[PDB]
């Protein structure tokens, strides 16, 4: 949703309907810090979410020994060594597709040919 | 049904009378309305039924 | 930003009342109740200075 | 409740001795005893209404008093249809025997304390006043 915060007291703003121009105005509840909104979206709720299947990837992901190694193709540097792990989300109806992280360039790629 | 984007849209109708405080708190009641379509609307079937499978 | 007291807060956040309005203290500031210390001193300063 | 309050204020309280009534008092309803009636207007030439109003004061308390005479005045507008309507209305009462004595002069108009519409402009203002006379969740959103 990309919440915006006030620049005076650091409080996240709320949308307010005005009949002067009929535009989305995000204002601060504390000091009336009124600003324009760069997107008409104010509320979003997903039932099935693909965000978090690649979570936890840092610059030192390949240094951890218990993550298994493969010999797949990394399409950024053509490397023969990479680590792989499934989706870290624990949903009961999630897929079993893997995610592969290269060590040379830290590029992530999935093994979903239905998606590809 | 043949569209690549599966979008259904809804709006609520404003009354002819003036609303001095309803429009300010409209977002919360629209959230409540989304919540009451989330679980309280039955497209088809009867209550107290979870999942049906077929066997031969 | 003209913070309020607690005696109204406990009554508002009990289930006695309905939905909390989004701009309640903006309406209170338009009325002029429980404002900042700066405005509270400025009102007395402009009352004394006009005499 | 307002009607009953006015009725007991008429019956018991002494600073209210005059009560103005519409056609409701013409019918058979309970009214306090009175000795004086003033009939300003009426529903055209109805002979029934005259005796209906006159029977209200026929049950006066002072009937045992010697020399007591109940008062029944019929205010009419001269040279207009009040004369015709009242002459038609008094036919049953004069057939019963009552005599309607005419009064064209009242001693006290010259030295009345309160003069109503004495000024010509107030009379004109009254004249143009008469002329100008003739889903358990969506329920909170509305
Ligand atoms: Zn602020
Ligand atoms: Zn690579």
UniProtKB/Swiss-Prot annotation, chain A:
Binding site for Zn(2+) 2: 74, 77, 102, 105
Binding residue positions for Zn(2+) 1: 6, 9, 28, 31
SMART domains listed in its UniProt record: RPOL9, ZnF_C2C2
Superkingdom per UniProt: Eukaryota
Broad class of where this protein is predominantly found: nucleus
Compartment list: Nucleus, Nucleolus
GO molecular function terms attached to this record: DNA-directed RNA polymerase activity; nucleic acid binding; zinc ion binding
Modified residues (Phosphoserine): 39
GO biological process: maintenance of transcriptional fidelity during transcription elongation by RNA polymerase II; RNA-templated transcription; transcription by RNA polymerase II; transcription elongation by RNA polymerase II; transcription initiation at RNA polymerase II promoter; transcription-coupled nucleotide-excision repair
Record's keyword terms, sorted: DNA damage, DNA repair, DNA-directed RNA polymerase, Metal-binding, Nucleus, Phosphoprotein, Transcription, Zinc, Zinc-finger
Gene Ontology cellular component terms for the protein in this record: nucleolus; nucleus; RNA polymerase II, core complex
Zinc finger (TFIIS-type): 70-110
A Pfam family matched in the record: Zn_ribbon_TFIIS
Zinc-finger ranges (C4-type): 6-31
Quaternary state and interactors: Component of the RNA polymerase II (Pol II) complex consisting of 12 subunits.
Record-linked PANTHER family: DNA-DIRECTED RNA POLYMERASE, DNA-DIRECTED RNA POLYMERASE II SUBUNIT RPB9
Miscellaneous comment as given in the Swiss-Prot or TrEMBL entry: Present with 2440 molecules/cell in log phase SD medium.
Family: Belongs to the archaeal RpoM/eukaryotic RPA12/RPB9/RPC11 RNA polymerase family.
Name the UniProt record assigns to this protein: DNA-directed RNA polymerase II subunit RPB9
Organism: Saccharomyces cerevisiae (strain ATCC 204508 / S288c)
From Swiss-Prot, chain B:
Subcellular location: Nucleus
Top-rank taxon: Eukaryota
Cross-link type Glycyl lysine isopeptide (Lys-Gly) (interchain with G-Cter in ubiquitin), residue numbers: 16
Outcome when changing residue 16 to R: Impairs ubiquitination during transcription stress
PTM field: The tandem 7 residues repeats in the C-terminal domain (CTD) can be highly phosphorylated. The phosphorylation activates Pol II. Phosphorylation occurs mainly at residues 'Ser-2' and 'Ser-5' of the heptapeptide repeat. The phosphorylated form of Pol II appears to carry, on average, one phosphate per repeat. The phosphorylation state is believed to result from the balanced action of site-specific CTD kinases and phosphatases, and a 'CTD code' that specifies the position of Pol II within the transcription cycle has been proposed. Following transcription stress, the elongating form of RNA polymerase II (RNA pol IIo) is polyubiquitinated via 'Lys-63'-linkages on Lys-16 by the RSP5-UBA1-UBC5 complex at DNA damage sites without leading to degradation: ubiquitination promotes RNA pol IIo backtracking to allow access by the transcription-coupled nucleotide excision repair (TC-NER) machinery.
Domain-related comment: The C-terminal domain (CTD) serves as a platform for assembly of factors that regulate transcription initiation, elongation, termination and mRNA processing.
Family: Belongs to the RNA polymerase beta' chain family.
Official protein name in the record: DNA-directed RNA polymerase II subunit RPB1
Shown segment, full-protein numbering: 1231 to 1286 of 1733
Swiss-Prot record, chain C:
Modification after translation, per record: Phosphorylated on Ser and other residues by TAF1 and casein kinase II-like kinases.
Location of this chain's protein in the cell: Nucleus
Subunit record text: TFIIF is composed of three different subunits: TFG1/RAP74, TFG2/RAP30 and TAF14.
Chain's role: TFIIF is a general transcription initiation factor that binds to RNA polymerase II. Its functions include the recruitment of RNA polymerase II to the promoter bound DNA-TBP-TFIIB complex, decreasing the affinity of RNA polymerase II for non-specific DNA, allowing for the subsequent recruitment of TFIIE and TFIIH, and facilitating RNA polymerase II elongation.
Note: Present with 1920 molecules/cell in log phase SD medium.
UniProt record similarity statement: Belongs to the TFIIF alpha subunit family.
Official protein name in the record: Transcription initiation factor IIF subunit alpha
Organism: Saccharomyces cerevisiae (strain ATCC 204508 / S288c) (Baker's yeast)
Range covered out of full length: 401 to 451 of 735
UniProtKB/Swiss-Prot annotation, chain D:
Highest taxon, organism lineage: Eukaryota
Modification Phosphoserine occurs at: 119
Stretches assigned to the Helicase C-terminal domain: 1-110
Subcellular location: Nucleus
Inactivation phenotype: Essential, it cannot be deleted; epistasis studies suggest it is involved in damaged DNA excision repair.
Subunit structure: Component of the 7-subunit TFIIH core complex composed of XPB/SSL2, XPD/RAD3, SSL1, TFB1, TFB2, TFB4 and TFB5, which is active in NER. The core complex associates with the 3-subunit CTD-kinase module TFIIK composed of CCL1, KIN28 and TFB3 to form the 10-subunit holoenzyme (holo-TFIIH) active in transcription. An additionnal subunit, TFB6, plays a role in the dissociation of the SSL2 helicase from TFIIH after transcription initiation. Interacts directly with TFB6.
Family from the record: Belongs to the helicase family. RAD25/XPB subfamily.
Other notes: Present with 825 molecules/cell in log phase SD medium.
Function description: ATP-dependent DNA translocase. Component of the general transcription and DNA repair factor IIH (TFIIH) core complex. When complexed to CDK-activating kinase (CAK), involved in RNA transcription by RNA polymerase II. May have 3'-5' helicase activity alone, the TFIIH core however has no 3'-5' helicase activity. Also involved in transcription-coupled nucleotide excision repair (NER) of damaged DNA. In NER, TFIIH acts by opening DNA around the lesion to allow the excision of the damaged oligonucleotide and its replacement by a new DNA fragment.
């Amino acid at each position: 949703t990309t919440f915006r915060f006030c620049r005076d007291c650091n409080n996240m703003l709320y949308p307010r309907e005005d009949k002067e121009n009929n535009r989305l105005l995000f204002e601060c509840r504390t000091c009336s810090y009124v600003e324009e909104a760069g997107s008409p979206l104010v509320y979003r709720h997903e039932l099935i979410t693909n965000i978090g299947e690649t979570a936890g990837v840092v610059q030192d992901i390949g240094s951890d020994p218990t993550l298994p190694r493969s010999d797949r193709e990394c399409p950024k540097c053509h490397s023969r060594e990479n680590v792989f792990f499934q989706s870290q989300q624990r949903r009961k109806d999630t897929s079993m597709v893997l995610f592969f992280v290269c060590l040379s360039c830290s590029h992530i790629f999935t093994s979903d040919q239905k998606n590809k | 049904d043949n569209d690549e984007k599966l979008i259904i849209r809804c709006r609520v109708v404003r009354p002819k009378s003036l609303d001095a405080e309803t429009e300010a708190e409209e977002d919360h009641m629209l959230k409540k309305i989304e919540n009451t379509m989330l679980e309280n609307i039955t497209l088809r079937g009867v209550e107290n039924i979870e999942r049906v499978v077929m066997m031969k | 930003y003209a913070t309020l007291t607690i005696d109204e807060a406990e009554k508002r956040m009990d289930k006695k009342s309905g939905e909390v309005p989004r701009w309640l203290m903006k309406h209170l500031d338009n009325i002029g109740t429980t404002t900042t210390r700066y405005d509270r001193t400025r009102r007395k300063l402009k009352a004394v200075a006009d005499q | 409740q307002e009607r009953m309050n006015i009725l007991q204020n008429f019956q018991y309280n002494d600073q209210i001795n005059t009560i103005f009534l519409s056609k409701v008092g013409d019918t058979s309803i309970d009214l306090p005893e009175a000795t004086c009636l003033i009939q300003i207007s009426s529903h055209y030439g109805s002979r029934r209404q005259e005796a209906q109003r006159l029977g209200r004061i026929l049950r006066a308390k002072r009937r045992n008093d010697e020399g007591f005479n109940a008062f029944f005045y019929s205010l009419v507008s001269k040279d207009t249809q009040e004369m015709y309507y009242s002459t038609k209305r008094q036919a049953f009462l004069v057939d019963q025997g009552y005599a309607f004595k005419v009064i064209t002069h009242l001693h006290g108009m010259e030295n009345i304390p309160n003069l109503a519409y004495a000024s010509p402009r107030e009379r004109r203002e009254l004249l143009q006043e008469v002329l100008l006379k003739n889903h358990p969740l969506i329920r909170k959103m509305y």
